[PDB]
């Protein structure tokens, strides 16, 4: 009798930051992806790899969903084999990823008069992340050779920074909500195909 919590995520008053992205696993329920697909309310749905036509019966082992929010200009940065701050240090996709990514504008809920400073993302890091890795660490970033000794100062920078969304901003700086559906490709029986 359990149903997929599709509506529960959508009506959330708050979404987590990109660095601390939330993973929700889809199990023991069937969701109709066609109605979402046919609506086309979203401007940006461009995904490749899997053909929408007559590929629906090939079964998948399990379905995973990840949710995070970013700026509009960075919505293209969520794509395989691409480089930039969000992709390299916050969320990375494998080259051979199979699936699709969904994004829609969220100006009205997120924006507030005077600014919304709760939302966070990471600027600097020592090395690029490898696919599907999350870091929560808030250790101070050291650029110079001198030891930082745990206090901010010269050549010492805090890792995280805030987004600052306001209603009057332009299209590029408006908040967009991105939810990805990842289908695992393995030779496995794949019992719940979920057409």
């Amino acid at each position: 009798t359990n149903l997929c919590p599709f509506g529960e995520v959508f009506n959330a008053t708050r979404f987590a930051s990109v660095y601390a992205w939330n993973r929700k696993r889809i199990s023991n329920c069937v969701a109709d992806y066609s109605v979402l697909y046919n609506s086309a309310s979203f401007s940006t749905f461009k995904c490749y790899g899997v053909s929408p036509t007559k590929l629906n019966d090939l079964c998948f082992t399990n379905v995973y969903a990840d949710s995070f929010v970013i700026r509009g200009d960075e919505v293209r940065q969520i794509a395989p084999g691409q480089t930039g701050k969000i992709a390299d240090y916050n969320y990375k996709l494998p080259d051979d990823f199979t699936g699709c990514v969904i994004a829609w504008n969220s100006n009205n809920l997120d924006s507030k008069v005077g600014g919304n400073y709760n939302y966070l993302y990471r600027l600097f890091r020592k090395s690029n992340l490898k696919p599907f890795e999350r870091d929560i660490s808030t250790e101070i970033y050291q650029a110079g050779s001198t030891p930082c000794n745990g206090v901010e100062g010269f050549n010492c920078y805090f890792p995280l920074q805030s987004y600052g969304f306001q209603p009057t901003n332009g299209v590029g700086y408006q908040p967009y909500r991105v939810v990805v559906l990842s289908f695992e490709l393995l030779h496995a029986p794949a019992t719940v195909c979920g057409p």
């Binding site: 600027l123 650029a143 110079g144 050549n155 920078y157 306001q166 009057t168 332009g170 299209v171 700086y173």
Partner: protein, 596 residues
């Protein structure tokens, strides 16, 4: 751990903080200007103080990084921009002293008073009425008393302050490795590059001199024509050979000659082109005005304008209790927001002003992509020149016929073109000698070539030799005439106008060449030509990243300012004035004076 990595990281932090600070400050200033109250000005002050403190702290922090080892052009450009450190070098007490000089000068200029000699009770301030008297009146004594009283009431108070002002400014200039304050101002056009694009601070003087020498003859002939025409209205005072007296030039300081049109029309019978009545006939509104301007800009090739512009900008003077300043302006708040504020009425002037403002907005939209510290024009003059091109192109009769304001059967007559050329000339050509002379005087005063005792002697000698204007009443060393101008009291440079007026016609000539126009230049129209739009966009996108010499090279094909297009623009006027001045004298002699 090379210094490049170190500088790059610092720069990234700065860029992401300064964006958020600047947006807050600009938003506060906008709501002040739209909505006036005490809370609004208090909020402006708080936001501005916060922004200034952050900028000062960051600049002091980054004076530390050695600059020579940087081997990338853009990063070097950004670091040089952040490391200006202008006035912090001076000590605290002297900084306070200079600040109180500037405040006192501005206050004295703002609240000046002048009173009639016949009627002591009547006393007027400059902005409400002295300007009205000077622009409208046609009486010798009425103009003379205003001209004398303004100087006698303002300059005597201003001069001792200006003395300490020049002394202290020279000290601060010397403290930061400059020979004089004039060098500091001239360093704006100074730029260092690699292959044939460098520019030296001293070359500006030579370039200005060379341009003036070529522009002189047209000014001579226009001066002769104006003298002959003004001989009729004032029979006794004006002499056939002498220079024109100062107080009859149409404004307080003689900067512009636009108000002398009624006295100097060549053909009074035929009227100038005005399409206000046609606008009222078709029931147009302000949004109609802006939509037509946007249509022109998309016709040339530039993008449409954002939805936030239509949603948030004020396009009409609002009713209610709300009070709004009426000066037109264009705003680029930051972070993708662009708004235009102006009270639009149904007139041709509003049409042209709307074109000018949207032009600025197009420039701002174009170079938005570049990093924060480089979001500005190539130099001062480019921003105004780009706007001027669009207005000049919009004013043509052909465009007005195309849009639908003028009847198709209307055709142009040579008298109307001559009148239009003279009206444009009185504004554009006349202003160049004034700006040139004022800049030269200021530069000489700063360097120390002109001793303190002979300031006014040199000022009026320069006026007589260069501009052709003679003082009505002899002036002693107590007066300070140059301080009467708004710009001198408020510490702004003035060469930007000369530079802009030079570059505007070069840009127009190049674009018209690309667009395949045949005939006189003054009939050019750039509508329905995508090539010109793309060529302009290529220069606009660059911003401040690359030398301005490179920017000019991209569009026009030359590395330095050239004055030939300006002469080409006014060739028919040159021939007509040559024909008309057959019997009159050309030139002026310095001996004659009104006081004799």
């Amino acid at each position: 751990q090379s210094t490049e990595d170190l500088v790059n990281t610092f720069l990234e932090k700065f860029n992401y903080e300064a964006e958020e600070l600047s947006y807050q400050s600009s938003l506060a200033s906008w709501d002040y200007n739209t909505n006036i109250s005490d809370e609004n000005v208090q909020k402006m002050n708080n936001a501005g103080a916060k922004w200034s403190a952050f900028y000062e702290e960051q600049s002091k922090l980054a004076k530390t990084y050695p600059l020579e080892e940087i081997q990338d052009s853009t990063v070097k450009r950004q670091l040089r921009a952040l490391q200006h450190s202008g006035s912090s070098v001076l000590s605290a007490d002297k900084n306070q002293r200079l600040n109180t000089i500037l405040n006192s000068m501005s206050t004295i200029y703002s609240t000046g008073k002048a009173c009639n000699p016949s009627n002591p009770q009547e006393c007027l301030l400059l902005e409400p009425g002295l300007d009205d008297i000077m622009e409208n009146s046609k009486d010798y004594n009425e103009r003379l008393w205003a001209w004398e009283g303004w100087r006698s009431e303002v300059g005597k108070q201003l001069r001792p302050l200006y003395e300490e002002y020049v002394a202290l400014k020279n000290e601060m200039a010397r403290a930061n490795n400059y020979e004089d304050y004039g060098d500091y101002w001239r360093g704006d056009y100074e730029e260092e590059w690699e292959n044939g694009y460098n520019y030296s601070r001293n070359q500006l003087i030579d370039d200005v001199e060379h341009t003036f020498t070529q522009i002189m003859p047209l000014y001579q002939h226009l001066h002769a024509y104006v003298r002959t025409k003004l001989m009729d209205t004032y029979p006794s005072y004006i002499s056939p050979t002498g220079c024109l007296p100062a107080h009859l030039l149409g404004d307080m300081w003689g900067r512009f000659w636009t108000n002398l049109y009624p006295l100097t029309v060549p053909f009074g019978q035929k009227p100038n082109i005005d399409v206000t009545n046609a606008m009222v006939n078709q029931s147009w509104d302000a949004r109609k005005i802006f939509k037509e301007a946007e249509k022109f800009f998309v016709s040339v090739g530039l993008p449409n304008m954002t939805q936030g512009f239509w949603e948030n900008s004020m396009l009409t003077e609002p009713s209610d209790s709300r009070k709004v300043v009426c000066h037109p302006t264009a705003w680029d708040l930051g972070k993708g927001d662009f708004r235009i504020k102006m009270c639009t009425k149904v007139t041709m002037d509003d049409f042209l002003t709307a074109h000018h403002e949207m032009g600025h907005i197009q420039y701002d939209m174009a170079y938005a992509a570049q990093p924060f510290l480089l979001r500005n024009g190539a130099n001062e003059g480019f921003h105004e020149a780009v706007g001027e091109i669009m207005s000049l192109s919009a004013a043509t009769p052909n465009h007005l016929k195309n849009i639908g304001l003028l009847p198709p059967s209307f055709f142009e007559d040579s008298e109307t073109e001559i009148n239009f050329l003279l009206k444009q000339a009185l504004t554009i050509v006349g202003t160049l000698p004034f700006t040139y002379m004022l800049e030269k005087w200021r530069w000489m005063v700063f360097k120390g070539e002109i001793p303190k005792d002979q300031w006014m002697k040199t000022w009026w000698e320069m006026k007589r030799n260069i501009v052709g204007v003679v003082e009505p009443v002899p002036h002693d060393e107590t007066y300070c005439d140059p301080a009467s101008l708004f710009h001198v009291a408020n510490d702004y440079s003035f060469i930007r106008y000369y530079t802009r007026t030079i570059y505007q016609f070069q840009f127009q000539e190049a674009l018209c060449q690309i667009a395949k126009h045949e005939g006189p230049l003054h009939k050019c129209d750039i509508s329905n030509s995508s090539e010109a739009g793309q060529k302009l966009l290529e220069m606009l996108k660059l911003g401040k990243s690359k030398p301005w010499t490179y920017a000019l090279e991209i569009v026009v094909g030359a590395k330095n300012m050239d004055v030939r297009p300006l002469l080409n623009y006014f060739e028919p006027l040159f021939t007509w004035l040559k024909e008309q001045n057959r019997n009159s004298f050309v030139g002026w002699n310095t001996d004659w004076s009104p006081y004799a």
